[PDB]
Structure formats: structure tokens, C-alpha cells
Design a protein around this ligand. Structure first.
Ligand SMILES: [Mg+2]
Ligand SMILES: [Mg+2]
Ligand SMILES: [Mg+2]
Ligand SMILES: [Mg+2]
Ligand SMILES: [Mg+2]
Ligand SMILES: [Mg+2]
Ligand SMILES: [Mg+2]
Ligand SMILES: [Mg+2]
Ligand SMILES: [Mg+2]
Ligand SMILES: [Mg+2]
Ligand SMILES: [Mg+2]
Ligand SMILES: [Mg+2]
Ligand SMILES: [Mg+2]
Ligand SMILES: [Mg+2]
Ligand SMILES: [Mg+2]
Ligand SMILES: [Mg+2]
Ligand SMILES: [Mg+2]
Ligand SMILES: [Mg+2]
Ligand SMILES: [Mg+2]
Ligand SMILES: [Mg+2]
Ligand SMILES: [Mg+2]
Ligand SMILES: [Mg+2]
Ligand SMILES: [Mg+2]
Ligand SMILES: [Mg+2]
Ligand SMILES: [Mg+2]
Ligand SMILES: [Mg+2]
Ligand SMILES: [Mg+2]
Lengths: 121, 252, 233, 56
RNA sequence: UUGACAUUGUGAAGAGACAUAGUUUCUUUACUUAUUCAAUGAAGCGGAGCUGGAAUUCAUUUUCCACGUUCUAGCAUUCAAGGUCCCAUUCGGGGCUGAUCCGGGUU
RNA sequence: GCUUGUGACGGCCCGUGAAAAUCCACAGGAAGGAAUAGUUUUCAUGCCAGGUCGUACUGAUAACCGCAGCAGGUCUCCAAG
RNA sequence: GAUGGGGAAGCUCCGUUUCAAAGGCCUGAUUUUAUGCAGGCCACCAUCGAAAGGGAAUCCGGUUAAGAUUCCGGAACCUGG
């Protein structure tokens, strides 16, 4: 016959088929378990006198929290571990290189109760 | 001894151009179908100062023959060119100030700026404010055209090499005395770091061929050989004469 | 007609963006494309020595078609046929006490370069087919001389790959015939005759003929309207 | 300020006539007249050079 | 920087020897494929032919130019509207033409 | 009045005094769309979400650099009678 | 300052869109179904480089031994969905 009709002076790399991997063997054997779970997210209460106050007067729980954990994970794992409902989480990094959470509960839950349910005073 | 000043200029540290504010490279339209068979029209949409350049630039707007869009070119504004004027670029274009035409298409005596050395090199000769080339003839077989450059030189280029009709705007700029160090200061501040200039005769030997002595003096002929070597050439290089030029110069 | 309007377009510079055209002549091809094409050009523009350039005289499709249909009977054993063969003679020979001749004398096309060469040297070949390809052209070029000095009739065939197909390879670079079954004896005689007169008989003349030196048509039409006008006015 | 123009309704960004939020409406009048006259005199050129092709 | 050798090939004219057949070597000037330089989102190159027409015909064409844009700071994009042929009539949609042929050497 | 902001102007230059992200608008009209009911979320109201790291204090005749709690050095904003 | 490249015995030097087959968006086609092909595009050729440049949007009151345009209270606004 005859030759193809190219309207463009440019020649682009033909669009070839890109196959997905079908590995003859598995990458890592067993998959790693959950690296940040609710028990690893929130490490201890923070029982400082001045944090204690925030529990009585503020309806805020004060937690030492994993440096790897964000507002989300600190909120979900508080909800999951303590049964409670969280208004907003504020976090900060302590000067000793540990992350502190101020967890403000909704007015439906009473932190002071929920604090000395878990057993600190 | 040290590396003298004119040697350091070559590695371009503090000596590169101060380019930040410049409007762009000034070029003729790429030499295409329209220009070499026909002509093509555009409007000068602006004429604007270029930092570190003595002559204005003309931003000229053309349609794109092969696609729906506007392609903007930067010419060097020829004197008398004005905003809103229509500019005609092509072999068959008429001869008026501002149009771009192949040298082969204009009679001798035509005065033309920003003229290409080879055809399509998007312009070379006579771009500084006030300059221009003249056509002093054509040799249609092996088609050439002969031009007199601003230097006084005569040169023969291809008849397809494009000029633009007229002279470049901003002429007479060199007639006005700088009057003071700062006016020169602010001048080179937008060009390159060439200013001010220490006399190599006020340096120490380690610094310059002219350096040192218990009096300031050059100590040996300041005319240096073409065949001299880097670090030697400071002076009047390859000078075939010297002293105050008495008598009219004006190439024959 | 009705609400429709004929309103043609002026594509004449100065106006009307150009339409889409076949720029195929202007395409900027991948480097690898430009090389294989410029290699071809570069091979034509240089004067080609006569011991190359005796190629490009390929056999012609007619004569070759007769030569491929004859050769195609003589294909070598396929893997199936040979496995099929062994089971025959394996049983029949080791049992029925045949001489290991429970199989017939084969008639097949010879091939492989080092094979065919010692054949030509031993004068056992009655026809040799040489490819016009073979990029290390050295592997081949001496075969016209060899076949000539040994009196073997040969032909330069388009398609080194087509020599492959008849022999069950991708590319065979040579195919040769030595044996023939008497049924095919008479066509080979006529096939060798036509081929002999297109190659071997011409060879001593071709050896003096340099090839190439061919201008590109931009330069061919150039001097064709130079050497037309300046001489004949 | 430029990103604030996405927080405001389109009638703060335009005036009604064509080329509304774009050209200054004396400039639109200019390119209305100029359009009409140049399309008209274009016709004046077609028929005059059509005569030149008939008479010559 | 200067010379020689290599990269280094093709013509043609002219000098030069076995001593006025052509293998050869240099000077001139041709060649383009090596090498080198410019340009471009490699876009209109080369060859031909239509139409025009200046042209003067020494049988008839022997040729050379051309061969869509210049009062205006507008508009120029949807394979193009038109024409025509197809699908089995649905809305959609495709050829050819519009936009002349030939050679893929981007110039 | 003082400090500051800002406007409309004027002087100056062989100096005519960045870039990009980003946002909007226009020209275009591809297309999609109603009467037994379609189109509209650049109009109003309404629902959800907004991660990571810094955030203390000094900034100096004692928290910086000068071997130091050194008469030195080290960028800036506010400014009463 | 990576990359196709090009130098360099080599550590590396050059080049930054450079002589490179350099990539991805809007939707259609699926009603084996999850996303291949269908058009049409766009050919932009890394990236790093500003806690004084550019830049989406928050205010007042109150509170601490020490935090605040960040908390509490009230009242807003921006971006995405
Ligand atoms: Mg924080
Ligand atoms: Mg030194
Ligand atoms: Mg520079
Ligand atoms: Mg200086
Ligand atoms: Mg001085
Ligand atoms: Mg001086
Ligand atoms: Mg001194
Ligand atoms: Mg010295
Ligand atoms: Mg000296
Ligand atoms: Mg001295
Ligand atoms: Mg002196
Ligand atoms: Mg309005
Ligand atoms: Mg100004
Ligand atoms: Mg706006
Ligand atoms: Mg809204
Ligand atoms: Mg503070
Ligand atoms: Mg402070
Ligand atoms: Mg110390
Ligand atoms: Mg001190
Ligand atoms: Mg690098
Ligand atoms: Mg950055
Ligand atoms: Mg910043
Ligand atoms: Mg800032
Ligand atoms: Mg306060
Ligand atoms: Mg404080
Ligand atoms: Mg609040
Ligand atoms: Mg919203």
C-alpha cells in the first residue's frame, strides 16, 4: 500500500502496554502487624498538678502520646480506649521530647469521672 | 606574579552580565514560509526601554500562521517606528521604515538595521543606538549584496539575509557628557562590573606588566604582539600605528 | 442551499491559519531511524567496489519463485517428523534387525555457512542460494568467487529471512542443494541454466563494474537542468 | 486581591455589555465601528478588483 | 604559529615520468556523502503541471516572469463551510473534494 | 501639630527601577437543556473536615560573639509634655 | 543541581532543554467488570534555593507561678468535600 499520514512534525514515544507485576515470589513473607495501635498511640496519663486542674475545671484529658501519632490517631484511640467522645485534640511536643495531648471531650462526657475511672488522682 | 585583571574576567564570577531587568533577546522573526515567499503583518504593541541597552525595543505582535494564537517578537525599535504601526516582514514586503526585507530586495542606498550575517540568523549587524548599514550593491548571480557596516567595513552577505529599514532609535546618546562618576557608575551597574578602572601603572609588579617602579611608567613598549600570550597582553595589542591621529580617517 | 452557506477559505499567507496537512516528509524521526536511512544513502553515494555491488543484482521474482517452489519440497525434518522417525527405526532397527537403515536416504536442503562452504569446496553442491543481506557482508562476498572457481552454479537471492523460512530458521544466510530425487532432476537443470546466465556467466564481467556514485534527486535534477541547458541551447 | 475574586459573585467581576469585565466600553465602541467599516470596505475592494479583472 | 603525515572521497581542465598511448602525482574549480556551522515545538523543499500573462511566432511554441494578504490598534481556533459519494437512515459518522501531481534530502 | 498610612500630581535618569506560583475575566460556542415540566449551586440557607513541625525565655555594660557576668561587637518595629 | 548525552586513567568535569522515541488531563467506551480502548487535546522536560520577597482565611474580652491572634468565652472567615 502506502505510508501513514502524520499531521504533526513531532514524533512521540509510542504508547506501549505497561504490565502489572505478577511476582513469582512474595515480597516480605508475613505482613508487618499494626505499627501504631490504640495502645501504642497514647502512652500514659499526664498527672501534673497543673494538668490535673484541666481535668477538673476544663473537661480535658492530658495524655503522653507517641511522637508518631497525629491529631487523628490521638482522637480515634482515645475514643476507642476510653469509650468517650472527643471535641478537639490539641497536641504539643514537650521539652523532653515527648508528645502531649490536650483532649477536650464534648459536654456529654465528664473528664474528672473518666479520669479517676482509669484510676489516677 | 599574580593573575592580572583582564585574565580574571574570563571565568565569569563578578564579571558576568547584570541581566535581571532586561526585556529579552532582541531577534527578528524566525525565517519561515511567509517571510521568504510572501510578507506578513504585525503591530508594534509597545516600545520600551531595555536596561543596559542604549536603544529602545519594540514589542511586535504577529499572528501564528500554523496555529490560532499570537506570537510576540522583540525587535530593536528603528527611529520613527511608533506604537500601533503595522510592520511588514517578507520578501514581497514594501520598503518603509520598520519593515523587514531581504537585502536582495532593496535598491542600493537603502538604509537598514539589525541585519543578518547569514540569512535567518535573526539579526547581527548594526544594533546599537544610532547605527545602520548601507547597501552598496548586489551581484545577482551567486546572489549577494554588499553593505558598509558602522565600523566602516565593507562586507558581502547573502541576498536573502534580512535587514529592517531605517536606523535604530536612541541616536546621539554618546554626545552628552557623563559629567560625574556616579552617572557612569549607574551606567555599568546595569551592564557588567567593568568600572572603575585601576591603571596597571599604579599597581605592583605582581599585579601587572606595567606594575611597579619608583615612578609610574610603563617601562617597556606598550604595543604588544598579536602572538603574545595570556598575561602579556595589556597595552595596545597588535597596534599597527599609534599616537594622535591627525587627518581624516574615512575608509576609501 | 437552504440555510447553508458556501464560504471558502483563503489559505494564502497573511490570513487563515493553515489547515492540517501531511507533514510526514518533515517528521523529526528517532535517531535510530535517521541512521538506517542515512546508512543506505551513504552506501549509494560512495563508489562501491566491484566485489561488493555484485550484490544488488538480486535474482528476479519469477526465476526465484520457481527456485523457491523447487527448494520447498526439500525442507529439513521438523521436530515432529524426526521424533516420529526415531520411534520408527528405534523399534524397527533394534528389533527387526534392519541395518539402522530402517529409514530411507534423506534428500534435504543443506544450510549453515560453514556447511555450504566445504560443500562448494568438495564440488558436492549443484545449486547455492546466497542472501543479498548478511550485514557482516564478509561472511558471503567470497562465495561468488568460490562458486565460480569450483564451477558451482550460484544465485544471489533477495531475502536472507526467506531462506530462513524454507529451512525452519529465522534467517538462513545461505541455502544449498546437493541431492535431488530424480523426479525433480529435470527442473533443476533448467533452473541452474537460467541462474548460471544471470550470475556465474556474467561474473567475470561484473568483477570490473563499480557501483554507487548515485546522486540524490535534489542534486540529480539539479545537474540534469544544468547539463541540459548549458550544452544544448 | 486576586484570590478574593473567587469569593465574589460574577456581577462584581463584570458589566453587562460584551467584553464586559475586559475592555473599557469606549474601547469596545471603537472596535465595533472599526470592525463594521473594515468589513464594509473589504467588500468595496472585492467588487472593484472584480471589475479590474473584467476590464483590462 | 608554521609544515608534514593521518582523518581524505568524486569529477573535470592544466602541468608532470617508462622516454608523444595512461596506472600516477601536484596547481586551478567543480562535486556531497565524511567532517564543520546556523535554524526550526524538523511546515511548506526539489521536480513537474494547471491557470494567467509579458513575449515574437519563421509552423507552433523556441521561452522568461509570476501563479489569494498594505488607508483603520477590529475579527481570523471546533478534521471547514460548500459540493459530492457512502452507513441503511437517528443522533451520530466516515471518505473524496475544497487544498493539482511526482521524490520522503527538515531547511 | 507629631508619627504613620494614602491619593491626585510634579522633579529625576546613557539608572526608567524582580520572578513565579496562584486567582479572576473576556472572545469563543462545543455541547446539554422546558410544559405535564426541565435547567440552574458564581443568589441565600444548611452538613462534615482541616494533618505535620515551631510556639518557653534572653536579644544584651549578665542569657549571642569577643577564653569571662569583658567600657568592644552584633539586623529592626512602637515613641508622651 | 539530577537526567539521554559529551569529556576525563579516574576520584569526577561539562551541559539543564542541552543533538533524546523524555509525559498526563479530561471524558467517553463497561453494563462478561473492572477499567482496556475511543476521540480531542497540552507538549510544560527534573528538582533544590526566601521563618525580611510573592502568599487563602480571626477578632475582642478573659484566664496562668510560667502559655496565648494557639487555652476559655463570644463573634467571624477561608479552603476542601
Ligand atoms: Mg503545635
Ligand atoms: Mg600566577
Ligand atoms: Mg548571565
Ligand atoms: Mg569594581
Ligand atoms: Mg583609572
Ligand atoms: Mg583608565
Ligand atoms: Mg603603589
Ligand atoms: Mg610581571
Ligand atoms: Mg613585559
Ligand atoms: Mg612599571
Ligand atoms: Mg607616567
Ligand atoms: Mg458590576
Ligand atoms: Mg516609570
Ligand atoms: Mg479580575
Ligand atoms: Mg455558593
Ligand atoms: Mg513568646
Ligand atoms: Mg521575649
Ligand atoms: Mg569557648
Ligand atoms: Mg560586653
Ligand atoms: Mg551537573
Ligand atoms: Mg522550594
Ligand atoms: Mg516566605
Ligand atoms: Mg513574606
Ligand atoms: Mg488577651
Ligand atoms: Mg508571656
Ligand atoms: Mg475559641
Ligand atoms: Mg464551599
Amino acid at each position: 500500500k502506502a505510508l501513514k499520514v502524520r499531521t504533526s512534525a513531532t514524533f512521540r514515544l509510542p504508547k506501549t502496554l505497561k504490565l502489572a507485576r505478577a511476582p513469582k515470589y512474595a515480597s516480605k513473607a508475613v505482613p508487618h502487624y499494626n505499627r501504631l495501635d490504640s495502645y501504642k498511640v497514647i502512652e500514659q496519663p499526664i498527672t501534673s498538678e497543673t494538668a490535673m486542674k484541666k481535668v477538673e475545671d476544663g473537661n480535658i484529658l492530658v495524655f503522653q502520646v507517641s511522637m508518631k501519632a497525629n491529631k487523628y490517631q490521638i482522637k480515634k484511640a482515645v475514643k476507642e480506649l476510653y469509650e468517650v467522645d472527643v471535641l478537639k485534640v490539641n497536641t504539643l511536643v514537650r521539652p523532653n521530647g515527648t508528645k502531649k495531648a490536650y483532649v477536650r471531650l464534648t459536654a456529654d462526657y465528664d473528664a474528672l469521672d473518666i479520669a479517676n475511672r482509669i484510676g489516677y488522682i | 606574579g599574580r593573575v592580572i585583571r583582564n585574565q580574571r574576567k574570563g571565568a565569569g564570577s563578578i564579571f558576568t552580565s547584570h541581566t535581571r531587568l532586561r526585556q529579552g533577546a532582541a531577534k527578528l522573526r524566525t525565517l519561515d514560509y511567509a517571510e521568504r515567499h510572501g510578507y506578513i503583518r504585525g503591530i508594534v504593541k509597545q516600545i520600551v526601554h531595555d536596561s543596559g541597552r542604549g536603544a529602545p525595543l519594540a514589542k511586535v505582535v504577529f499572528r501564528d500562521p500554523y496555529k490560532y494564537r499570537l506570537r510576540e517578537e522583540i525587535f530593536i525599535a528603528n527611529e520613527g517606528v511608533h506604537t500601533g504601526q503595522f510592520i511588514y516582514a517578507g520578501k514581497k514586503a514594501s520598503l518603509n521604515v520598520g519593515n523587514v526585507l531581504p537585502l536582495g530586495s532593496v535598491p542600493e542606498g537603502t538604509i537598514v538595521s539589525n541585519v543578518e550575517e547569514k540569512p535567518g540568523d535573526r539579526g547581527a549587524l548594526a544594533r546599537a543606538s544610532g547605527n545602520y548599514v548601507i547597501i552598496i550593491g548586489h551581484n545577482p548571480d551567486e546572489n549577494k549584496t554588499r553593505v558598509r557596516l558602522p565600523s566602516g567595513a565593507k562586507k558581502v552577505i547573502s541576498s536573502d539575509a534580512r535587514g529592517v529599514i531605517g536606523v535604530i532609535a536612541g541616536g546621539g546618546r554618546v554626545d552628552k557628557p557623563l559629567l560625574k562618576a556616579g552617572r557612569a557608575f549607574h551606567k555599568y551597574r546595569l551592564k557588567r562590573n567593568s568600572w572603575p578602572k585601576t591603571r596597571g601603572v599604579a599597581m605592583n609588579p605582581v599585579d601587572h606588566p606595567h606594575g611597579g617602579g619608583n615612578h609610574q611608567h610603563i617601562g617597556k613598549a606598550s604595543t604588544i604582539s598579536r602572538g603574545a600570550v595570556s598575561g602579556q597582553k595589556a597595552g595596545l595589542i597588535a597596534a599597527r600605528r599609534t599616537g594622535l591621529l591627525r587627518g581624516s580617517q574615512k575608509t576609501q | 442551499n437552504p440555510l447553508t452557506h458556501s464560504t471558502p477559505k483563503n489559505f494564502g499567507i497573511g490570513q487563515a491559519v493553515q489547515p492540517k496537512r501531511n507533514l510526514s516528509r518533515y517528521v523529526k524521526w528517532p535517531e535510530y531511524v535517521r541512521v538506517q536511512r542515512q546508512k543506505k544513502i551513504l552506501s549509494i553515494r560512495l563508489k562501491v567496489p566491484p566485489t561488493i555491488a555484485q550484490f544488488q543484482y538480486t535474482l528476479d521474482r519469477n526465476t526465484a519463485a520457481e527456485t523457491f517452489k523447487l527448494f520447498n519440497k526439500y525442507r529439513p525434518e521438523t521436530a515432529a517428523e524426526k521424533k516420529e522417525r526415531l520411534t520408527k527405526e528405534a523399534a524397527a532397527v533394534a528389533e527387526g534387525k534392519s541395518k539402522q537403515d530402517a529409514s530411507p536416504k534423506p534428500y534435504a536442503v543443506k544450510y549453515g555457512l560453514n556447511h555450504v562452504v566445504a560443500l562448494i569446496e568438495n564440488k558436492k553442491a549443484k545449486l547455492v542460494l546466497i542472501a543479498n543481506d548478511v550485514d557482516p557482508i564478509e561472511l558471503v562476498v567470497f562465495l561468488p568467487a568460490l562458486c565460480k572457481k569450483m564451477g558451482v552454479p550460484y544465485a544471489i537471492v533477495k531475502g536472507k529471512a526467506r531462506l530462513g523460512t524454507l529451512v525452519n530458521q529465522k534467517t538462513s544466510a545461505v541455502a544449498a542443494l546437493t541431492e535431488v530425487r530424480a523426479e525433480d532432476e529435470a527442473a533443476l537443470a533448467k533452473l541452474v541454466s537460467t541462474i548460471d546466465a544471470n550470475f556465474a556467466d556474467k561474473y567475470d564481467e561484473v568483477k570490473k563494474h563499480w557501483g554507487g556514485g548515485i546522486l540524490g534527486n535534489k542534486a540529480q535534477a539539479k545537474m540534469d537542468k544544468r547539463a541540459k541547458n548549458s550544452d544544448s541551447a | 486581591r486576586p484570590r478574593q475574586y473567587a469569593t465574589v459573585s460574577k456581577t462584581h467581576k463584570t458589566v453587562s455589555r460584551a467584553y464586559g469585565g475586559s475592555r473599557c466600553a469606549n474601547c469596545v465602541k471603537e472596535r465595533i465601528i472599526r470592525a463594521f467599516l473594515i468589513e464594509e470596505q473589504k467588500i468595496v475592494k472585492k467588487v472593484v478588483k472584480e471589475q479590474t479583472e473584467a476590464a483590462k
